[PDB]
């Protein structure tokens, strides 16, 4: 009824869900009686299985066409662009998200994986890095992911700065850190990059030096990073 | 031969928007406009419009459903009942709800649980970013606080007949019964805002003559005077004047017997204030929830 | 490096270097059929074709990871057995070393960890697929593998009755009779028990151990 | 490795003018070593045809506005020279009220020096380093610390009155809001993206709105710092954010009047019906008071990293990175003249005052800069 009864139901577009598996995503089995909703709700269904990305029902009177397109399979992963950051660890970052060969292209994770390499971009101290994906389609529904990386110029620490030390001296305390206010010119093997596991490190050997001198009281009341406004000028607080 | 049932219009995240509830929210704003098609006169905008509305409702259902906010029939019993005028819910409103779209009863309800969905959590996300000072709420009833001098405070709106400064016998009998025949009018139960917009040459002509809230003792001296005895909803006559005739109305009155020497006032100044503070976080959270997410038109 | 000739012609390239024997061209051949049609009609025979041609040309990591792949994404296929017997004989083949095998020395005293896991993926292919064609060859690697890890627990088991750790001699025979009862290897490693009883002066187990062993003499 | 093959995104070349006037240094003093390579707020100041200026190191100069000629100098470093003589790291712009001459310090300290002689007439320990130039005003110094606190100091006595504790977010942009005074009010911008007002008498919060857009999840797509200082003309606060929107408020209610799509940290200039604003791309604008409605945009200096400008003979000023001062017409936004007075650039604030125009370079050279 509504729906007119259904005698037969035919899949296309189909290329790596098998018929069956189809079928039981469907909630109707040629019930004989469908209506609108049940359509609706067919729909909704099989897009909720995650495998397509495109659904339509169509009706002949008696047969339920339904055409889907299925989410294109990955062919290759390319990086270009990339003057620091090597492929191989780009590449097992890859397969943590999902996108790998021979799998599936999850378009909603593209965003996500953009985001997370700028992150990455942003904790060395490459602020400005973008990172954006192209999906170009090869046939037999196929696609390649090419990561087109723009990497700017690394921020460099202009200043590393403890507010409080009444005891010690800034310069004695900092010579024990990790990262670099300045560099003497016959060094030539250190540079003023930046890197947020480094300054928690360095966070830590600053409280270690304290309370190994038998304060037991040192704290940190807070910590700032600042950044000029051309981003290559970190500042450390 | 083949017809086409359904189809996705768009992709949102991991959900999508079904060309049916597309023509079905199609179907609601031409009822909407059909009461008064001045409202939506726009066709293609208003497809746009609806799409995005689509959007929106899908982001926040999923964002809803990933907290897990669920709602019971229970909750949805009554909520619809007592809001018809005079209907006799949950029995003739299913009734009447057959000649227009329950083609299936549930339809309805299943909407209706969708859209308390949606409300629950935009209240509760819009409300968690909302952050009210106590001074704020104090500087906002102040102004009224020292206004309350009066025991009762009128809602007023005022309409002006002009006059030269010298005017001829012949202009202000004009005048006069032009004003004569506004204030019959609106004692007839004639709109006293469209009579202002076509009548009144005050500034508020355009907004309808509403002058708002005040206290009767600083509005001119004809006003005050001519006020003493007025009441919620009275229409008082002209009031003659070297620049032309008055006329003036009361929208509604408000008062407390308690001493203001403000008085259980901060009150409604939350509510006021918690009312914009909503509005315009609800409007950046549904602007940083339509950036942040995943949409694909496919309406093609 | 492989041409972009059209499906048929690369599977038939592919078959034809198979039947030659040349397997690195025809693995080659199949890695471009299957990368470039990863779900096309050639997907399960190219697939079964990449694992023959993996385990003969000794890259058994690879084999593993394509049976792997094909047990995981077909997991009814009517030639699912052939999978799981050649997973058992790739774990077979990586407890095998050609050098000494020229110079017939006994590995059993080596890693059994994949001894072990040959043990495993042939017991499942025997008890999942009784009428198998690959049940027989299954069933005497299964003997075999069993009697190598028997002789690996009586090696430790010999090496410790050297060193005089009697404790963990007594511990090594008890493991062999409760996992290996039914070896070579726990009989040859029975006496042992006797003599790690008697060192430490426990004549009752001494005595039940050497009824066992009369009781058993051959 | 690639440090070196590394290239920056952008900069504009230099701009082909002709001048329609001769523009002409009166004079130029050496301060010292200057701020240097460090993004600072320190600029000088003018005050009774006499100016003040200073450096990282701690040299303070009075110096005579005609000419140029040093009235008087002191060293705020350690007097003792407890330790290597350290710099005073001398960050708060050069403020000059009453009697007074007001200096921010990166040590938490505020020092306030003798107009007459130069002497410290005072100096407090603040909660964080003092980035902002102090705002005198109702007898009280306003200084914004790093660590997002805002506090009050006394003129006279120079303890601290009362401070306000301002939410600081994960990263933010170098420098912090000068408040700006309104009927007792001071309103302030923050690093989190918010413009709030507090009162003088005691620092009890009015009103706290937010300005900022922040359409990102990243760090870098949410810096929303309001670095600028707001400015309060006929009832209606102006703000201005990094990445957000020159906004309109309400001066008594904080209520947003109306929004644009333009963001920097430089300062604008609100003036009869007109803001000219410097983008934080270094593009000029000049925009209408009622509303964002654009009147001209000049973008031919784009990533050149220029100063905030300043309103000097009817003509808009902006220093740049590389030591050049560009004239601009308000009415048009023409290019009128170009000048190199310097070669180590600028990066602080010009000041235009009692018909003189003061900038000082990177290196520490203070330039009067006639026409």
């Keep these: 009824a509504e729906g007119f009864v259904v005698k037969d139901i035919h899949f296309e577009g189909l290329q790596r869900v098998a018929v069956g598996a189809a079928l039981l995503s469907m909630p109707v089995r040629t019930g004989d009686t469908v209506n609108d909703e049940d359509i609706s709700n067919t729909i909704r269904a099989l897009f909720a299985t995650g495998n397509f990305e495109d659904v339509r029902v169509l009706r002949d009177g008696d047969t339920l066409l339904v055409q889907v397109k299925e989410r294109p399979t990955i062919a290759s992963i390319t990086f270009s662009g990339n003057k620091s950051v090597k492929d191989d660890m780009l590449k097992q970052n890859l397969e943590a998200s999902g996108v790998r060969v021979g799998e599936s292209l999850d378009r909603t994770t593209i965003a996500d994986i953009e985001k997370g390499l700028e992150d990455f971009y942003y904790s060395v101290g490459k602020y400005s890095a973008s990172v954006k994906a192209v999906v170009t389609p090869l046939p037999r529904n196929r696609v390649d992911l090419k990561l087109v990386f723009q990497e700017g110029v690394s921020a460099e620490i202009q200043q590393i700065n403890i507010v409080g030390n009444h005891a010690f001296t800034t310069d004695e305390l900092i010579s024990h850190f990790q990262l670099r206010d300045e560099v003497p010119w016959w060094n030539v093997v250190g540079d003023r990059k930046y890197q947020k596991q480094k300054l928690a490190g360095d966070l830590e050997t600053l409280r270690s030096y304290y309370l190994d001198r038998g304060y037991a009281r040192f704290n940190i009341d807070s910590t700032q990073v600042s950044l000029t406004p051309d981003k290559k000028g970190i500042y450390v607080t | 031969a083949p017809q086409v049932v359904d189809k996705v219009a768009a992709v949102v995240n991991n959900g999508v928007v079904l060309e049916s509830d597309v023509d079905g929210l199609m179907q609601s704003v031409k009822l909407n406009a059909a009461q008064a098609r001045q409202q939506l006169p726009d066709d293609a905008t208003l497809r746009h419009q609806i799409m995005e509305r689509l959007i929106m409702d899908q982001i926040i259902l999923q964002m809803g459903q990933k907290m897990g906010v669920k709602i019971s029939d229970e909750q949805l019993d009554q909520a619809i009942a007592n809001i018809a005028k005079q209907n006799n819910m949950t029995l003739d409103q299913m009734r009447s709800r057959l000649a227009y779209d329950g083609l299936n009863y549930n339809t309805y309800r299943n909407q209706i649980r969708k859209e308390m969905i949606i409300s629950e959590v935009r209240n509760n996300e819009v409300r968690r970013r909302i952050t009210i000072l106590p001074q704020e709420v104090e500087s906002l009833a102040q102004q009224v606080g020292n206004q309350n001098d009066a025991s009762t405070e009128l809602n007023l709106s005022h309409i002006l007949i002009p006059l030269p400064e010298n005017p001829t016998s012949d202009q202000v009998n004009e005048a006069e019964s032009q004003a004569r025949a506004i204030v019959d009018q609106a004692r007839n139960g004639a709109d006293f805002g469209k009579l202002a917009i076509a009548h009144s040459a005050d500034q508020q002509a355009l907004n309808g003559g509403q002058m708002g809230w005040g206290r009767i003792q600083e509005l001119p001296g004809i006003f005050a005077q001519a006020l003493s005895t007025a009441k919620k909803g009275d229409i008082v006559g002209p009031i003659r004047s070297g620049v032309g005739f008055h006329i003036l109305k009361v929208n509604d009155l408000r008062g407390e017997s308690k001493n203001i020497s403000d008085a259980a006032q901060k009150d409604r100044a939350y509510r006021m204030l918690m009312n914009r503070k909503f509005s315009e976080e609800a409007a950046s959270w549904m602007q940083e929830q339509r950036a942040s997410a995943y949409v694909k038109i496919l309406s093609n | 490096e492989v041409p972009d000739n059209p499906p048929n012609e690369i599977y038939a390239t592919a078959q034809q270097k198979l039947q030659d024997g040349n397997w690195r061209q025809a693995i080659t051949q199949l890695e471009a059929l299957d990368n470039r049609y990863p779900f096309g009609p050639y997907s399960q025979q190219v697939q079964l074709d990449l694992i023959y041609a993996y385990y003969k040309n000794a890259d058994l990591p690879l084999a593993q990871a394509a049976i792997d792949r094909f047990i995981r994404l077909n997991p009814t296929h009517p030639n699912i057995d052939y999978v799981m017997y050649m997973r058992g004989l790739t774990n077979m083949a990586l407890d095998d070393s050609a050098l000494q095998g020229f110079f017939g020395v006994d590995r059993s005293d080596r890693d059994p960890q994949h001894a072990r896991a040959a043990f495993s993926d042939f017991s499942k292919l025997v008890r999942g697929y009784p009428n198998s064609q690959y049940t027989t060859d299954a069933t005497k690697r299964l003997v075999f593998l069993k009697d190598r890890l028997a002789k690996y627990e009586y090696s430790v088991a010999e090496y410790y009755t050297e060193r005089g750790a009697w404790v963990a001699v007594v511990n090594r025979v008890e493991g062999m009779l409760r996992d290996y009862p039914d070896t070579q290897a726990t009989r040859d490693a029975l006496p042992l028990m006797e003599n790690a009883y008697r060192q430490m002066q426990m004549n009752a187990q001494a005595e039940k151990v050497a009824k066992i062993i009369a009781a058993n003499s051959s | 490795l690639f440090n070196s093959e590394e290239d920056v995104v952008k900069m504009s070349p230099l701009p082909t003018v002709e001048n329609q006037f001769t523009p002409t240094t009166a004079w130029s003093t050496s301060v010292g070593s200057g701020i240097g390579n460090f993004y600072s707020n320190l600029h000088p100041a003018?005050?009774?045809?006499?100016?003040?200026?200073?450096?990282?190191?701690?040299?303070?100069?009075?110096?005579?506005?005609?000419?140029?000629?040093?009235?008087?100098?002191?060293?705020?470093?350690?007097?003792?020279?407890?330790?290597?003589?350290?710099?005073?790291?001398?960050?708060?712009?050069?403020?000059?009220?009453?009697?007074?001459?007001?200096?921010?310090?990166?040590?938490?300290?505020?020092?306030?020096?003798?107009?007459?002689?130069?002497?410290?007439?005072?100096?407090?320990?603040?909660?964080?380093?003092?980035?902002?130039?102090?705002?005198?005003?109702?007898?009280?110094?306003?200084?914004?610390?790093?660590?997002?606190?805002?506090?009050?100091?006394?003129?006279?006595?120079?303890?601290?009155?009362?401070?306000?504790?301002?939410?600081?977010?994960?990263?933010?942009?170098?420098?912090?809001?000068?408040?700006?005074?309104?009927?007792?009010?001071?309103?302030?911008?923050?690093?989190?993206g918010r413009v709030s007002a507090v009162l003088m008498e005691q620092g009890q919060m009015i009103w706290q709105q937010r300005i900022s857009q922040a359409t990102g999840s990243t760090e870098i797509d949410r810096l929303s710092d309001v670095d600028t200082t707001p400015v309060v003309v006929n009832g209606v606060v102006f703000a201005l954010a990094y990445n957000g929107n020159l906004t309109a408020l309400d001066l008594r209610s904080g209520q947003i009047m109306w929004k644009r799509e333009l963001g920097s940290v430089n300062d604008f200039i609100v003036d009869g019906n007109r803001i000219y604003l410097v983008d934080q791309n270094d593009r000029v604008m000049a925009l209408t008071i009622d509303g964002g409605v654009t009147l001209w945009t000049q973008s031919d200096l784009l990533h050149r990293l220029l100063t905030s400008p300043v309103l000097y003979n009817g003509n808009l000023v902006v220093g740049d990175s590389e030591g050049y001062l560009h004239w601009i017409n308000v009415e048009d936004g023409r290019f009128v003249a170009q000048q190199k007075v310097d070669s180590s650039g600028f990066q602080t604030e010009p000041v235009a005052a009692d018909g003189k125009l003061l900038i000082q370079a990177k290196d520490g050279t203070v330039y009067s800069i006639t026409r």
């Design chain 4, 46 to 192: 003018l005050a009774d045809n006499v100016v003040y200026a200073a450096d990282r190191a701690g040299l303070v100069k009075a110096l005579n506005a005609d000419d140029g000629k040093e009235i008087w100098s002191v060293s705020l470093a350690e007097k003792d020279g407890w330790f290597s003589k350290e710099p005073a790291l001398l960050s708060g712009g050069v403020t000059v009220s009453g009697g007074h001459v007001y200096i921010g310090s990166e040590k938490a300290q505020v020092y306030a020096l003798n107009t007459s002689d130069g002497t410290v007439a005072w100096q407090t320990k603040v909660a964080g380093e003092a980035l902002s130039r102090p705002v005198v005003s109702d007898g009280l110094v306003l200084i914004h610390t790093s660590n997002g606190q805002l506090q009050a100091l006394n003129e006279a006595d120079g303890a601290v009155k009362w401070t306000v504790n301002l939410d600081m977010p994960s990263l933010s942009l170098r420098g912090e809001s000068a408040p700006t005074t309104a009927f007792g009010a001071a309103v302030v911008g923050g690093d989190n």
